[PDB]
Amino acid sequence: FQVYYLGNVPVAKPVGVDVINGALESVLSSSSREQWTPSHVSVAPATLTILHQQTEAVLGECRVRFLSFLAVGRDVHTFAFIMAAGPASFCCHMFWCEPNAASLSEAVQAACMLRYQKCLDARS
């Protein structure tokens, strides 16, 4: 079906379902569905690229090695991941997924798994 990019917000910690549900509640409170940006995520072990639906304009690109955490929200449509934007600086990227966030969350976990193996292969 369809993914919507909800945007991103700073967060205080690199990990935690509490942190991502906090971020999702803030963003959900301050936007209406009409404002949500239709999009899709190009997932690779190196990077995730968030692309606008028709135009394919780049809305973000995130390196998988600095993704610290990801989760599905308490509402099953929600997906979020936390990026270590810097050593002590964390940014949460959030999505609404129809029919639910399962396939996208699992793709992004899979990128992290393959990227991690690369890190081990690099130093074997």
Binding site: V17, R65, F66, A102, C112
Partner: peptide
Amino acid sequence: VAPEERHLSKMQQNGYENPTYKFFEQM
């Protein structure tokens, strides 16, 4: 418990810590 719902509940309850970041962090 469908195959979806098991992985799905874990994704909600626990999420997932990227071992790449945890690896590259220790060093």
